[PDB]
Amino acid sequence: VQLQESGGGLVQPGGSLRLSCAASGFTFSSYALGWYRQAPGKEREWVCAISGSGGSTYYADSVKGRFTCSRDNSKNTLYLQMNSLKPEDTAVYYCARVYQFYGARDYGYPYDFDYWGQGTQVTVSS
Amino acid sequence: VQLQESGGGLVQPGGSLRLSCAASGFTFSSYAMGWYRQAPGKEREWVCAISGSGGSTYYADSVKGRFTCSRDNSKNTLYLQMNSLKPEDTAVYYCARYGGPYDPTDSTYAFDYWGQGTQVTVS
Amino acid sequence: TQLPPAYTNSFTRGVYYPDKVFRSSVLHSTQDLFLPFFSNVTWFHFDNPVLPFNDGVYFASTEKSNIIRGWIFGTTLDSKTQSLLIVNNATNVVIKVCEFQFCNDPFLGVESEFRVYSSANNCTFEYVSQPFNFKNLREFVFKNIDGYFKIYSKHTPINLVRDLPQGFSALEPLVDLPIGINITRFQTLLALHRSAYYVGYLQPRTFLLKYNENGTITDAVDCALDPLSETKCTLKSFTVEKGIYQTSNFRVQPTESIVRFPN
Amino acid sequence: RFASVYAWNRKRISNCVADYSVLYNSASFSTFKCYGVSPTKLNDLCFTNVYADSFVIRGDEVRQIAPGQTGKIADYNYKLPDDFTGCVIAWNSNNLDSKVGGNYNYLYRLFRKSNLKPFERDISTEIYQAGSTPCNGVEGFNCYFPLQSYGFQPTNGVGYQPYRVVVLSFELLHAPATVCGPKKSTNLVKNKCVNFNFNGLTGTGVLTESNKKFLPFQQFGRDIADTTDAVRDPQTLEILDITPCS
Ligand SMILES: *[C@@H]1O[C@H](CO)[C@@H](O)[C@H](O)[C@H]1NC(C)=O
Numbered sequence: 001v002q003l004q005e006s007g008g009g010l011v012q013p014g015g016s017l018r019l020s021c022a023a024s025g026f027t028f029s030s031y032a033l034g035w036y037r038q039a040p041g042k043e044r045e046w047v048c049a050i051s052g053s054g055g056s057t058y059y060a061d062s063v064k065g066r067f068t069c070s071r072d073n074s075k076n077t078l079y080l081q082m083n084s085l086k087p088e089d090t091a092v093y094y095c096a097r098v099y100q101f102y103g104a105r106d107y108g109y110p111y112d113f114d115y116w117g118q119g120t121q122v123t124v125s126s
Numbered sequence: 127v128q129l130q131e132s133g134g135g136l137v138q139p140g141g142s143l144r145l146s147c148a149a150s151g152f153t154f155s156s157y158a159m160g161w162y163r164q165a166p167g168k169e170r171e172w173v174c175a176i177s178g179s180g181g182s183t184y185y186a187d188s189v190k191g192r193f194t195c196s197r198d199n200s201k202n203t204l205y206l207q208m209n210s211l212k213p214e215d216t217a218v219y220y221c222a223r224y225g226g227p228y229d230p231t232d233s234t235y236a237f238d239y240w241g242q243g244t245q246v247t248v249s
Numbered sequence: 250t251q252l253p254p255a256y257t258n259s260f261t262r263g264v265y266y267p268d269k270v271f272r273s274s275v276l277h278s279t280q281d282l283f284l285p286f287f288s289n290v291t292w293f294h295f296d297n298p299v300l301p302f303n304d305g306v307y308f309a310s311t312e313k314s315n316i317i318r319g320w321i322f323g324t325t326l327d328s329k330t331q332s333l334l335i336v337n338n339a340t341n342v343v344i345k346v347c348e349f350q351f352c353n354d355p356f357l358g359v360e361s362e363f364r365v366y367s368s369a370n371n372c373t374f375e376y377v378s379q380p381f382n383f384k385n386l387r388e389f390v391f392k393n394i395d396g397y398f399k400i401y402s403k404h405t406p407i408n409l410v411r412d413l414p415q416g417f418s419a420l421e422p423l424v425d426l427p428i429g430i431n432i433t434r435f436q437t438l439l440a441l442h443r444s445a446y447y448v449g450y451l452q453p454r455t456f457l458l459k460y461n462e463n464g465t466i467t468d469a470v471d472c473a474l475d476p477l478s479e480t481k482c483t484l485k486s487f488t489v490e491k492g493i494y495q496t497s498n499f500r501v502q503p504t505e506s507i508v509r510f511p512n
Numbered sequence: 513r514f515a516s517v518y519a520w521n522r523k524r525i526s527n528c529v530a531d532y533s534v535l536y537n538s539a540s541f542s543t544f545k546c547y548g549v550s551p552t553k554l555n556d557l558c559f560t561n562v563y564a565d566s567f568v569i570r571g572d573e574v575r576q577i578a579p580g581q582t583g584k585i586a587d588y589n590y591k592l593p594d595d596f597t598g599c600v601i602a603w604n605s606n607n608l609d610s611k612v613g614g615n616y617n618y619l620y621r622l623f624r625k626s627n628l629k630p631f632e633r634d635i636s637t638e639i640y641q642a643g644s645t646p647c648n649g650v651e652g653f654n655c656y657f658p659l660q661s662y663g664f665q666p667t668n669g670v671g672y673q674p675y676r677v678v679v680l681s682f683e684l685l686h687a688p689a690t691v692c693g694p695k696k697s698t699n700l701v702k703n704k705c706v707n708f709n710f711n712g713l714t715g716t717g718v719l720t721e722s723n724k725k726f727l728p729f730q731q732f733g734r735d736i737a738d739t740t741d742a743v744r745d746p747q748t749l750e751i752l753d754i755t756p757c758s
Contacts, residue, residue, distance in 0.1 A: 044572075046671065060669075099575075104542040104603060109670035111543060112575035158637050170616045172657055175637050184639055187652050224619075224659075225519020225635050230371050236515030240617050271726045271733030271742070374527040374690070396688040422729050427527075429560075429687020464727055 001025030001115070003095060008120035016083040017122065021095030023076035032098035033071060033078045034058070034110055036117060039091040048080065049098045049110045058101055058108030062089070085124060093120050127151055127234075131221060134244035137211055142193075145206040145244050147221040153239065154178050154202035158224040161195055161206055163217040164243075173219065174206070211248045218243040250295050257412050259288040259449055263307045264456065264469045265390050265401040265420035272460040276485050278472075279458065282392060282451035286471040290413075290449040297356065299326070299436045305392040305451035306435065311383040311407060315339070317446055318357055319438040321365070322391070322398070324431050326351045328368060331430045333398060336365065336438060342378035346428055347371070351436075358441030365438065373429070382410040383445070390420055391435075392451070398428040413447060419458075419466035457482045514609075514676055516619045517567040517589045518659060519635050525562040527690045531555065541603045542675065547579050548597035549682065555693035561683040562691050565590070568609060568618045570662055572671040574602055577679060588621045592679070593630035602677040609664055609674040616661040618674065623658045631681070700745060705757035710743045715754065722751035 002024035009017050023033070034049030048069035049058040057069055068081040078095060094117020101110040133145035145161075148154075160175025174195040176183040183195050193208045204221050220243055226235045263284025284290075284307040291300075300306075302322065310317045318339070323332025328350035335344050339360050348370035355365045390401040401420040408414075437446060459468040472482035479496040480489050515521035532554040536544060549557075567590060569577070576583035579596040586592065592600075609615055623640035637658065641647050644654035664674045700719070707716045713732055722742050726733065732743040742753045 100543060100545070103544060104540045106604060106606075107542050107670065109571065111571070112578075158635070160637070169614065169663065170661065172659075175657075177637060184637070184650050184657070186650065186657070190649050190651065222617075224637055225515060227635060228371075228522065228633075230369075234513070236519050236521040237513050238516060238617055238619070266727075266729070269729055269731045271724070271730040273724065273733070275736060371524075373687070396686070421727065427688040427690045429685065463725060464730060464733070 001027045001031075001097065003097075003115050003117065005095065005118045005120055008093070008122050010123045010125055011085055013085070013087055013124050013126055015085060015124075016081065017085065018079070018081055019093055019120065019122070020077055020079040021117065021120075023078065028076060030073055032101060032110075034096060034098045034101075034113075035069065035078075035080050036094040036096045036113075037091045038094060042091065045091075046110055047093070049101045049108065050078070051102065056102055056108070058110070082122065085122070087124050087126065090123050093117070093122050095120075127153075129153065129221070129223070129239045129241045131219075131241040131244045133206075134219070134246050136247040136249060139212055139248055141211055141248075142207065142209040143211070143246055145208060145219055145246070146203060147241055147244075148201070148203040149223070149239065152233075153223060154197070154204065155199060157226040157235075159197070159204050159221060160224070161204075162220045162222060164220070165214075165217040168217075170220070175224070176204070208246065211246075213248050216247050216249075218245050220244070252295055255292040256289050257292050257447065259284050259286060259290050259307070260413065260415045261286055261417040261469070262309070262388065262413065263288075263390070263449065263451075264417070264458070264466060266422060266466065269422070271464045273464055274462055275460055276487065277458050277460065278455060278482060278485065280453065280455045283454045283456055283471075284390075284449045284451055285454060286474050288449055290447045292412075292445075292447055293437070294445040297354070297437060297439060299434050300448055302391075302393070302432045302435050303450050304453075305390065307388075307390055307449040307451060308437075308446065309386065309388045309413060310446040311386050311409065311413065312445060313382075313384040314442065316440050316442065317387075317437060318440050320391075321351060321355070321436040321438065322432045323435070324433050326434065326436070328370070331373070333426075333428055333430065333432070334365065338363070341380050343375070344377075344426065345375040346373045346430065355436065355438055356441055357438060359443045361443070362441075376426075382408050384408070386414070388418075388420055389423075390451070393428070393432045396427065396429040398424075398426045398432070400424045400426075417468055419469075455482065457485065457487075459487060514566050514568045514605075516617075517569045517573075517585060518619055518621045520565055520567040520590060520633065522633070523564040523566070525564055525691065526560075529694055530559075530562060530691050531694050533693075535601065541601055543574060543602045544599065545578065546599040549599060554599075558689035558692040559682045560685040560687050560689050560691065563681040563683065565679040565681065567677050567679075568605065568674055569620070569677055570664075570671070571604075571673050571675050574675055574677065577602075577677055584622060585620065587627045588624040589628070591628040591630045591632065596630075596681070598679065598681045600677065600679050602675050604673060605676040606664075606666075606673040609676075610666045610668075611664070612666060615664040615674070618662045618664070619659045620662065621658050622660055623656045697747065700748070702752075708743075711746060713740065713743060715740060717754040717756055719752045719754060722753040724751050724753070726751055 004022040004024050007019040011017050030052030032051045035047035037045040037047050047063050050071045071078045096113045098110040099112035102108050127150045129149040131147040158177045161173040162170050163173045164170035174185045174189050176197050192210045195206045197204050220241050222238050222240045229235045267279050267281045282305050319336035324330050328348050333346050349366040350368040351366050352364050386405040386407040388403045392399045400423045402423045403420045455472045457470040458466050461467045470478045470481045472478050480494050483496050536551040573585045576586040579594045639647050639650045640656050640658050642654040647655040650657050702719050733741050735741045742751050
């Protein structure tokens with residue numbers, strides 16, 4: 001299975017951008033996918049994860065409401081809309097595929113993953 | 127089964143304090159045990175550790191040389207002899223046991239058994 | 250007190266139920282490891298030797314004083330491999346399997362002392378029973394079959410000082426323990442007195458066992474014991490009518506090998 | 513109490529009946545992954561020994577307890593064989609292990625001389641010298657104390673909460689198996705032609721009450737031609753005669 005990169009960009013603070021990363025590889029069949037956030041000065045951060053077979057979606061506290069995380073299983077595309085981007089939210093955003101993320105209540109955060117996003121620079125200019 | 131800490135107190139800079147702790151049953155014999163400290167404004171950090179059967183002691187960079195930590199294997203009692211204290215040394219000190227070897231009988235060899243805390247103040 | 254070796258005869262003892270099958274008023278021919286009838290049985294009594302286990306062991310005692318309390322079974326008994334320790338502590342009965350370093354003179358006494366072993370190891374399992382002339386004959390059969398240690402036993406009231414009483418009684422299964430070790434030797438554990446046992450070995454044999462109406466074995470014929478027993482076995486009867494019966498084949502055995510090739 | 517990941521607790525489970533369907537069916541396990549076994553294969557297969565291994569580890573490290581994986585925990589705190597048979601079960605303990613101010617009681621190893629062998633446990637407190645200069649006591653010149661604490665806060669990211677993990681390792685030895693799953697029984701049916709299985713004895717016939725008595729250790733009987741004639745029900749200690757179906 002293969003990864004992809006689409007979107008990114010520089011926006012004004014308070015603006016919005018669209019992200020996504022098409023599903024690649026002949027072996028992909030509704031596997032859970034999600035969004036990874038990384039920056040030189042920050043700990044590894046999970047943005048969201050969507051279960052392909054059920055639609056159950058995990059969101060991080062800094063992501064809920066502000067950003068919309070969704071996936072189209074007919075197009076096999078993973079999409080996230082970066083609404084109201086803040087200066088504090090600037091980072092490189094990666095598209096990873098979630099092995100597992102929800103066997104219990106009070107959970108949804110991804111446990112295991114395999115291939116990391118290549119490169120999508122999302123920045124702001126005040 | 128349980129550990130109880132004692133000693134502590136208030137000293138002037140340059141003074142010394144003998145801290146101690148002890149535990150019931152086969153807690154200290156054939157196990158490693160050591161000390162940790164937590165300043166009132168800081169997270170808890172490692173101070174020293176002594177192997178009960180080994181007898182050697184390792185000390186933190188802020189501990190080595192200035193003050194020592196020891197033990198008594200017959201009384202299963204741990205001692206710390208603190209000296210050359212500075213205002214920066216004010217903290218609550220704890221002792222704790224490291225997990226040990228497998229014991230075929232009903233035992234708690236793998237547990238840490240953290241103590242209650244001994245307050246050491248410099249002023 | 251230096252004792253000599255001594256031996257006696259098994260008579261008709263050493264038969265046990267080979268299976269858990271109920272039969273009624275039939276004669277059943279079976280092949281299993283059994284103590285031969287009238288087999289030479291070694292008599293011990295100041296005696297705690299280590300004996301071989303071979304195929305299985307027939308053990309019996311005639312006591313009124315509760316002196317024999319247990320057994321050690323194993324391959325070496327030297328802490329290098331696993332051994333099975335079965336001891337009646339006069340409180341409970343403890344069965345455990347460990348790589349124990351055994352004493353070279355194990356004993357019990359009064360309970361005031363328990364030696365048996367020095368060091369111990371990680372046991373596979375442990376079982377502990379609930380807390381609790383000669384008058385008591387205790388008979389046991391110990392077998393090690395496909396990793397399972399099977400014990401059969403019987404307790405018979407007796408009145409005899411010198412030897413095993415004569416008669417017939419079948420031993421009933423007691424335990425079937427999933428041990429999984431090889432057993433080649435064993436030692437008997439006896440208590441010291443404070444304020445007599447027989448050991449035989451099992452051999453592959455065919456027996457014709459007589460079951461009564463209630464499924465109890467009341468008699469048996471050891472087919473290899475005597476031509477009359479062979480006749481009883483081939484006819485599946487303990488009563489043989491007057492006549493001539495063919496029971497076996499006389500075969501001369503070779504004793505030497507010859508290997509010949511040209512010079 | 514659960515043990516720290518470095519000095520994890522290994523409970524040897526033997527000589528018992530292992531009910532596994534309850535663990536799979538039970539709620540609130542954050543992960544339950546089986547390697548070489550299946551929830552539809554367990555509770556039936558018999559094993560010689562089962563080893564439970566219990567550790568408290570940060571959520572981000574849960575992925576490291578699996579065959580074929582690497583990482584600081586997999587390499588220095590708990591190495592699992594790649595040829596592993598068994599199940600890794602874990603659940604959130606944020607409402608148990610977290611404490612106000614942070615729970616620093618759980619330790620893990622960051623500095624180890626070499627990778628940990630599969631199922632090998634280490635309780636050493638020896639100082640790691642990092643291959644540079646003699647330590648002669650830990651000091652801040654490429655010389656480190658091997659064990660560090662976790663900071664489990666009541667409020668933290670999900671990946672930073674404590675999780676309790678139990679790994680059930682299944683061992684098959686040459687000894688007779690001692691750990692089997694539960695057996696299921698049906699209601700007893702009398703006076704009908706019924707296919708029956710009593711322990712390991714199977715057949716088809718009509719079960720009726722018997723007037724025969726069996727010794728306490730006898731489970732079934734046979735007739736004059738070694739054909740099964742009666743059985744003693746494993747749960748009700750009564751004798752049942754078997755009549756062939758016409
Ligand atoms: C199983 O439990 C029932 C409960 O009534 C009891 O009557 C029966 O004797 C038990 N069976 C065995 C084999 O213990």
